[PDB]
Design a protein around this ligand. Structure first.
Ligand SMILES: O=c1ccn([C@@H]2O[C@H](COP(=O)(O)OP(=O)(O)O)[C@@H](O)[C@H]2O)c(=O)[nH]1
Ligand SMILES: O=c1ccn([C@@H]2O[C@H](COP(=O)(O)OP(=O)(O)O)[C@@H](O)[C@H]2O)c(=O)[nH]1
Lengths: 268, 268
């Protein structure tokens, strides 16, 4: 009964208002139910902070997103439909309805705009509007050791410049205050992008309170790689993190000197 | 009946396929009916050429566009509804059905994404996808003397570089071969954008046959100015051409040194 914007309306709101964004997906609900996820062990301080931010209302300073799953599941792949309609919502729908009482939310799938869409025709337009958020911007990327967002592809080639804060690939929440301090030291006037699972959501909220603009964009790199491959399955990549292969086994980095030169702090 | 894509679907096609685009609006149908328009006098070679291009089918090399008016006019302002439904289509509907027999067409309103829309919420996203077509590209802009596309706004600030071929502000068709000659001399590998009324349509078509990529984007600058000012009416601008003020009275150019430096040929 919760009202969730489409991807097109969510991205347009970010383009219109310049708002920050924080997204909550199935893994955040897992932790709010007291259950660990693969790259974040359960932590009560984390779950309470996630439990708090989910209940917040959206405005021109910060848009809060939920999975666009409370209606029209025919939009998604048969595997995605089976997950939401037969696994997640049976468990947690009454939790969503209890906690999430804002008038409206953005779509958490602005990060996930390809592989699980039944019709992939509009994906090109989603990635185009995403790229417009950072076109000609100086960027601060806050991501984990294996994320390597944009490494090996042209996702961020339209940005003016990139600096990166490298965080733990898992259980990053225990270093949250150290990460925040690194962001303060290096952010200047840059747009902050974060790819950091549950920790990213607390990070964005906290940095918004300090007057930064930050976008939680999660697994955008994996979805972009699949989009460029024309993939039909969540094919695992060998040289960086892959969405829904969250244990990070069988990864060996390729030498990227541009990436290495963008690192300004390493907390992994 | 004729099947016309939405603006969202048309822009996504150009992003996906990299196709060139030609759009036909009410002024071209005016000429195909043997009538002069304000900035283009009747010429039998032009009108026959426009009718010929209108009848062509769209593909990954070239998308042919028509006004998205044969259905769902509730999408537009009442002024636009009255024009198409009581003025244009009463005269020319049987001509459209006779000439336009392709399976599908793009939307000519990819150039017109704001002032005549009833709901202006998605316009921000339309301009974002348009900007992505030329982001980080070297551009060759082919336009009339009063067009001054991008002058005084940030429409093309995301482009890598701009050269301009300046043409007659009206009756440009009489200089078509000289304009084409200028394009061959200065285009190199640049993306060609044209804002040149009915001559733009023949130009793009002819340039496609020679293996260039060209986008007929017409009155995009006026719609962007209205969008940025949040206008609710087609307010006339005093320092350049304004769409639907086509006689070009009462125009005094602002001195723009970037514009001046971008001109590489002048045929006005
Ligand atoms: O402690 C953590 C948790 C996650 N991640 C990264 O967070 C990203 C995914 O974030 P999120 O779960 O928000 O993605 P979504 O699937 O929601 O789009 C991936 O690049 C992971 O490597 C990380 O670096 N450290
Ligand atoms: O001989 C001409 C005819 C038109 N134009 C320009 O063509 C543009 C509009 O093109 P079009 O009619 O294709 O616009 P649309 O309304 O279809 O988007 C305006 O900038 C006009 O100044 C021009 O420079 N020379």
């Amino acid at each position: 009964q919760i009202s969730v914007l489409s991807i097109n309306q969510s991205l347009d709101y970010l383009l219109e208002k310049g708002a920050s964004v924080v997204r909550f997906g199935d893994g955040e609900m897992d932790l709010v139910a007291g259950r660990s996820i693969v790259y974040q062990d359960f932590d009560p301080e984390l779950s309470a902070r996630l439990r708090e931010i989910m209940s917040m209302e959206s405005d021109e300073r910060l848009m809060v997103c939920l999975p666009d799953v409370f209606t029209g599941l025919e939009r998604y792949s048969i595997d995605a439909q089976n997950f939401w309609s037969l696994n997640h919502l049976p468990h947690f729908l009454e939790k969503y309805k209890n906690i999430c009482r804002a008038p409206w939310y953005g779509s958490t799938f602005i990060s996930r705009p390809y592989i699980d869409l039944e019709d992939k025709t509009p994906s090109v337009g989603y990635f185009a509007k995403l790229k417009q958020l950072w076109q000609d911007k100086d960027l601060l990327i806050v991501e984990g050791l294996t994320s390597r967002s944009g490494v090996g592809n042209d996702l961020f080639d339209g940005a003016r410049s990139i600096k990166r804060i490298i965080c733990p690939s898992r259980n990053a929440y225990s270093k949250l205050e150290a990460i925040k301090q690194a962001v303060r030291e290096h952010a200047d006037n840059r747009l902050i992008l974060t790819m950091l699972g549950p920790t990213a959501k607390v990070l964005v909220y906290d940095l918004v309170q300090e007057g930064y603009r930050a976008l939680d964009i999660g697994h955008i790199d994996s979805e972009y790689e699949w989009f460029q491959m024309g993939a039909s399955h969540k094919v695992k990549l060998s040289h960086k993190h892959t969405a829904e292969h969250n244990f990070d086994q069988d990864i060996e980095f390729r030498d990227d000197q541009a990436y290495d030169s963008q690192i300004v702090a390493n907390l992994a």
